[PDB]
């Protein structure tokens with residue numbers, strides 16, 4: 486049981502040691518396309534790149550590159566697309582990816598500004614009457630409605646392919662209180678948000694992979710996806726979180742950026758497992774503890 490495992494790690498004080506092991510054992514794959522001179526202005530950070538083997542390709546002749554990776558968890562039967570916070574020049578590319586990959590959900594775990602510095606472009610409309618048009622990729626994006634809670638907001642967006650005039654509803658799940666290299670306020674706060682995403686339908690296997698991003702698309706995004714995947718495994722199945730993280734790190738570098746994020750992943754999975762094992766009351770308990778109202 487990982488509860489027994491957790492307390493022993495806490496007792497030995499070995500979180501930093503385990504985390505450093507994970508970094509050492511993590512896959513090292515080439516990112517040659519990301520590092521092409523022509524793609525320099527498409528990367529938010531020089532030290533964060535998608536692997537060639539798992540990168541998302543835009544369906545365009547000129548340049549198919551976007552800083553985004555397909556994480557395909559075979560046993561858990563879920564795929565995620567992890568990407569950086571879009572740049573002012575890659576917002577069109579971002580929504581092109583969403584369209585082409587047929588995603589119906591976007592999970593945002595950062596703020597556009599944190600500690601007085603920009604971490605992400607304003608890639609979605611904040612007001613109904615100010616829709617966005619992405620001329621380079623011929624897409625239109627409209628805010629239809631929003632549901633604002635204390636620490637997260639769920640937005641209903643309409644994405645239109647202007648070429649075909651087909652439209653799709655995209656749900657935008659914005660976690661607003663998760664700082665860079667930090668952790669969520671509580672396991673309850675995180676899990677209340679995660680299951681909101683789960684219950685929305687956005688993660689349906691009939692849809693394309695959910696798009697998850699923060700600023701770099703590795704720390705907070707990695708934490709989110711690790712916890713979700715482990716919970717999936719606990720239901721389908723003795724879950725080895727280090728092993729699952731190393732598996733995910735085959736698809737994108739640097740997933741989970743601090744030892745404390747690793748520790749939090751344990752806490753979240755342990756607490757979330759209560760719901761998995763059949764205790765109804767725990768979900769409304771999270772909601773109360775999250776103080777979303």
Ligand SMILES: CNC(=O)[C@H](Cc1ccc(C(F)(F)P(=O)(O)O)c(Br)c1)NS(C)(=O)=O
Pocket residue numbers: 530531532533595604664665666699700701702703704705706742
């Ligand atoms: C150490 N590298 C950096 O700080 C940045 C890249 C980076 C990596 C990870 C994050 C994050 F963990 F917070 P995430 O949750 O994934 O957004 C951030 Br923010 C930034 N590179 S640097 C040294 O060029 O500025």
Ligand SMILES: [Cl-]
Pocket residue numbers: 521522523524
């Ligand atoms: Cl080039």
Ligand SMILES: [Cl-]
Pocket residue numbers: 595596597598
């Ligand atoms: Cl924001």
Ligand SMILES: [Cl-]
Pocket residue numbers: 508738739740741742
């Ligand atoms: Cl790392």
